[PDB]
Amino acid sequence: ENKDMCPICKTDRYLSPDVKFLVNPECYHRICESCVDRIFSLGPAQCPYKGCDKILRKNKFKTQIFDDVEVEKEVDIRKRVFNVFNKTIDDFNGDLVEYNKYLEEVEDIIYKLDHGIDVAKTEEKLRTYEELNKQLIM
Amino acid sequence: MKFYIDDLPVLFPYPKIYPEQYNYMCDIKKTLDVGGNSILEMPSGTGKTVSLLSLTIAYQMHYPEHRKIIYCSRTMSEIEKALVELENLMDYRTKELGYQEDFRGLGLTSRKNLCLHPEVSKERKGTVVDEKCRRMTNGQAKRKLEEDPEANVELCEYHENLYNIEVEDYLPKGVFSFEKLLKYCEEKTLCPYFIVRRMISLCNIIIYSYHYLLDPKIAERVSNEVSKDSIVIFDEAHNIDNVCIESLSLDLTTDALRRATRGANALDERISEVRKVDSQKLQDEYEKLVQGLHSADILTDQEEPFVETPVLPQDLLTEAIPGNIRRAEHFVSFLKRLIEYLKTRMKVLHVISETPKSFLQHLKQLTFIERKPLRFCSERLSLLVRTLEVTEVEDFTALKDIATFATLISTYEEGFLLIIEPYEIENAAVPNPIMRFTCLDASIAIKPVFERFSSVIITSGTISPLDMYPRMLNFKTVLQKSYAMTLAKKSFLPMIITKGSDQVAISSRFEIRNDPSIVRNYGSMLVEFAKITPDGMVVFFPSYLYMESIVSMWQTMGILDEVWKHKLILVETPDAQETSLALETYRKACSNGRGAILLSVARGKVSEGIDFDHQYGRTVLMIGIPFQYTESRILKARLEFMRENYRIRENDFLSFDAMRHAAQCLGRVLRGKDDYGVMVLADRRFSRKRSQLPKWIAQGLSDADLNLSTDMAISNTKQFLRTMAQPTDPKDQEGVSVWSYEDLIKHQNSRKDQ
Numbered sequence: 027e028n029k030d031m032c033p034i035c036k037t038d039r040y041l042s043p044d045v046k047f048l049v050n051p052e053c054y055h056r057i058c059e060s061c062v063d064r065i066f067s068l069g070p071a072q073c074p075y076k077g078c079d080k081i082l083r084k085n086k087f088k089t090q091i092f093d094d095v096e097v098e099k100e101v102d103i104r105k106r107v108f109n110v111f112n113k114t115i116d117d118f119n120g121d122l123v124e125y126n127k128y129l130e131e132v133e134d135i136i137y138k139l140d141h142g143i144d145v146a147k148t149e150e151k152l153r154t155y156e157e158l159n160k161q162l163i164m
Numbered sequence: 165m166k167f168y169i170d171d172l173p174v175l176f177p178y179p180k181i182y183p184e185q186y187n188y189m190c191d192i193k194k195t196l197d198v199g200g201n202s203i204l205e206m207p208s209g210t211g212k213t214v215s216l217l218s219l220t221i222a223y224q225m226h227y228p229e230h231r232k233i234i235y236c237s238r239t240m241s242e243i244e245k246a247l248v249e250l251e252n253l254m255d256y257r258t259k260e261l262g263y264q265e266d267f268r269g270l271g272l273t274s275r276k277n278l279c280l281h282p283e284v285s286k287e288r289k290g291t292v293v294d295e296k297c298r299r300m301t302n303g304q305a306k307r308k309l310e311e312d313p314e315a316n317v318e319l320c321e322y323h324e325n326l327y328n329i330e331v332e333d334y335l336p337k338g339v340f341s342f343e344k345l346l347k348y349c350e351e352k353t354l355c356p357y358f359i360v361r362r363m364i365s366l367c368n369i370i371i372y373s374y375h376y377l378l379d380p381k382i383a384e385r386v387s388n389e390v391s392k393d394s395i396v397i398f399d400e401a402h403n404i405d406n407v408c409i410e411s412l413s414l415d416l417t418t419d420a421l422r423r424a425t426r427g428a429n430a431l432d433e434r435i436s437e438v439r440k441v442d443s444q445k446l447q448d449e450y451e452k453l454v455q456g457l458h459s460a461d462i463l464t465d466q467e468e469p470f471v472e473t474p475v476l477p478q479d480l481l482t483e484a485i486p487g488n489i490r491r492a493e494h495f496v497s498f499l500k501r502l503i504e505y506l507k508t509r510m511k512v513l514h515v516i517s518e519t520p521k522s523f524l525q526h527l528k529q530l531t532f533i534e535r536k537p538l539r540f541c542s543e544r545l546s547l548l549v550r551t552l553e554v555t556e557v558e559d560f561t562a563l564k565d566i567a568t569f570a571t572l573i574s575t576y577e578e579g580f581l582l583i584i585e586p587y588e589i590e591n592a593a594v595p596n597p598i599m600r601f602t603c604l605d606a607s608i609a610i611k612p613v614f615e616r617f618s619s620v621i622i623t624s625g626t627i628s629p630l631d632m633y634p635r636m637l638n639f640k641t642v643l644q645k646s647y648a649m650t651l652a653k654k655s656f657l658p659m660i661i662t663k664g665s666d667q668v669a670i671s672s673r674f675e676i677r678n679d680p681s682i683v684r685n686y687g688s689m690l691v692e693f694a695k696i697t698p699d700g701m702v703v704f705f706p707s708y709l710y711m712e713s714i715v716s717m718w719q720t721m722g723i724l725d726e727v728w729k730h731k732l733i734l735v736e737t738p739d740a741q742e743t744s745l746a747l748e749t750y751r752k753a754c755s756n757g758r759g760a761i762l763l764s765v766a767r768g769k770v771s772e773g774i775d776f777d778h779q780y781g782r783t784v785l786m787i788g789i790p791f792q793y794t795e796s797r798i799l800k801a802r803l804e805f806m807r808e809n810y811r812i813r814e815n816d817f818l819s820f821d822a823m824r825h826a827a828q829c830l831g832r833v834l835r836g837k838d839d840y841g842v843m844v845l846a847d848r849r850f851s852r853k854r855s856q857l858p859k860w861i862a863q864g865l866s867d868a869d870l871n872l873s874t875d876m877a878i879s880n881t882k883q884f885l886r887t888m889a890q891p892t893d894p895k896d897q898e899g900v901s902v903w904s905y906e907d908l909i910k911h912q913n914s915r916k917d918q
């Protein structure tokens with residue numbers, strides 16, 4: 027937060043926190059404009075956010091401004107899952123139990139995705155997304 | 165005395181009577197025969213409560229239909245006031261009739277001021293007391309107690325002795341005024357709380373505050389036995405919309421937002437810990453979801469129900485499963501996502517106001533959480549916590565604040581309004597945004613009781629105009645009848661002090677600040693009033709921040725030392741224990757020798773329920789007119805609604821409210837027709853709002869008494885106090901205005917049947 031907002035500018039709340047601390051949809055990290063720009067400009071290099079080695083991508087970042095990254099992961103994961111499972115049957119005929127259960131199943135992957143317990147079911151959730159994406163293509 | 169309404173023997177508690185009481189008996193009984201509302205402004209100069217209780221007590225025990233009576237005074241000071249008087253009438257009625265009571269009537273306020281469990285009761289805030297008793301007497305904690313005889317679940321043992329003898333029967337016979345109820349229940353070591361709540365199904369008449377009728381969070385236990393064919397009275401019903409808008413509005417601060425994260429993690433901890441030990445229960449409530457909203461153990465809860473329904477009592481709720489939310493990890497991941505979309509609208513840079521839907525859409529824009537699952541948050545959290553059976557709520561306090569908001573904004577539309585103030589302009593440019601959310605139509609809250617109840621009465625000493633209420637509240641009336649004060653004497657002085665000695669118009673509308681002309685002018689008027697009025701004098705600033713600024717620099721000048729030579733000075737502090745310690749010492753000094761001066765805020769707590777008798781009030785004052793656009797645009801928004809939904813302008817609404825509380829303050833110094841005292845008005849605008857005052861006040865405010873300088877005000881009240889100090893008791897002109905005992909009513913009025 028006020029003590030971790032970048033590899034470079036970790037303390038940025040009182041350093042005019044107007045510059046953008048982007049999460050790469052694959053970084054989930056607080057990267058001040060200096061480092062994140064430095065990175066995607068050269069390209070997908072890691073954001074050195076506190077020993078980090080995860081590739082701060084090229085210009086594919088999203089916006090997450092300090093939204094409790096446990097939520098930012100929980101928010102970024104749910105939308106893609108809710109997009110991968112976009113409308114797998116939820117209003118095909120108007121059912122409320124199955125749709126909500128399918129909904130109760132829908133974000134249960136996201137809750138698992140936001141958790142990633144011992145991951146072997148999150149991988150199973152990914153195969154469902156590929157199955158959901160394969161079903162979407164057809 | 166026992167006359168007739170041509171059908172109703174009336175055991176009026178006093179052998180004497182008053183004329184306006186009888187016209188009230190006439191028109192209320194005229195209102196009780198035909199289903200109507202008939203707002204009846206009863207000037208507090210007479211005893212409206214005595215006239216109210218004597219006839220309805222007659223009506224219900226004369227007629228066989230209206231078995232239940234309801235009487236909603238604003239505050240709990242007025243609750244016991246009705247309780248003690250009903251007790252006196254009841255005794256007097258027995259004193260003439262014998263034993264024809266078969267009557268139970270109990271007041272109904274709360275746990276904290278009724279909890280006889282000391283440790284529970286020694287606490288201060290409402291929350292811990294009630295919750296102590298809960299963990300102390302919980303249908304789970306008790307289960308934790310009898311199933312596991314152990315030290316962990318205490319019980320009040322008042323709840324238990326409630327449970328033993330009391331929940332078969334009732335308290336012996338009394339109309340237990342709060343003084344009487346507690347003593348008995350403390351003598352019977354009975355929790356008068358768990359007692360009185362369970363004889364709601366048994367009391368003939370019930371006395372409770374507006375919140376329990378209007379605040380839906382506590383208006384859930386509504387039982388049709390007290391409700392169905394019952395007869396309803398609204399006493400002191402001018403502050404109805406404010407209580408309604410109060411009972412439906414909501415706030416948020418980034419700091420409270422921080423608290424929810426802790427609970428959300430603490431839930432993310434609390435959900436995680438129960439599920440490892442016992443998730444087979446947590447699934448058990450998942451199928452208890454898929455069948456329905458789980459009413460078997462979310463509403464049928466003796467001591468369990470955790471999160472109340474901030475929404476109206478269960479009208480606008482659907483019964484299905486909350487979409488995704490069936491899962492608790494959903495719910496916490498869902499709650500993990502909702503607490504963060506507020507923080508970004510929290511930090512919204514300036515004031516922005518949204519409708520519940522556009523915000524709901526804008527929410528749906530950033531995150532597609534449907535309105536329908538969103539609406540289910542309140543009871544969804546309530547149950548889980550009890551399935552969590554959590555030990556503490558403090559980590560979860562900011563959690564239920566959000567459940568109230570999400571249910572509200574996802575349910576209501578087109579009557580409410582969001583607004584995003586990112587600061588308080590009184591300390592602007594600091595981190596303290598607020599997510600203000602409030603209602604605009606006060607008809608909404610009253611519509612169900614107007615939809616539910618048939619025979620209702622609206623009665624106050626102050627209601628003016630009696631038509632603003634049918635407009636705002638959107639309801640039908642029959643006898644909107646008020647009565648004038650027919651007196652054989654003057655008995656009070658309303659004055660318009662527009663000018664000071666400098667002949668200078670005065671106000672608090674200029675600022676909430678100092679302008680040594682007006683301030684010293686105000687200081688001069690106060691110090692001379694402190695010289696002239698007898699023991700008991702009160703004043704009413706438009707705003708406390710007006711009081712604080714003006715008073716502080718009044719001690720700066722020598723104005724405070726002089727009144728300290730004459731009288732006692734007793735301030736109104738926000739903490740009311742000090743205020744109470746002030747007020748009783750004001751009344752004590754009023755009943756004692758050295759004069760007592762009580763200075764309060766027109767919009768403050770003292771004006772709501774506290775009375776000023778002969779000695780406790782002589783000369784009320786009103787420095788300027790109470791106005792609120794000192795503060796931000798929330799009134800503008802509702803006023804805009806007041807302007808768009810109703811044909812009500814800015815000034816007409818503001819002057820109505822300003823004179824609504826102006827009228828509310830002036831009438832307390834008077835108790836009966838034998839009471840007197842000065843009600844001076846001190847502002848230029850009071851010259852033009854003489855009509856906005858209630859009739860009985862307006863009848864007393866004459867043309868020559870307009871825009872008076874402060875100087876001839878003192879001469880007028882000087883002769884007033886002298887002449888009033890005389891014992892002007894003809895006892896035959898009082899045959900006109902007292903209508904001597906049972907005859908001048910039976911002689912003259914039974915001649916008046918023309």
Ligand code: SF4
Pocket residue numbers: 275278279280281284285293294297298300301319320321322323355356357358
């Ligand atoms: S009602 Fe009973 S359990 Fe509740 S606070 Fe009072 S004494 Fe304690």
Ligand SMILES: [Zn+2]
Pocket residue numbers: 031032033034035036057058059060061
């Ligand atoms: Zn940096």
Ligand SMILES: [Zn+2]
Pocket residue numbers: 049050052053054055056073075080082
């Ligand atoms: Zn990162």
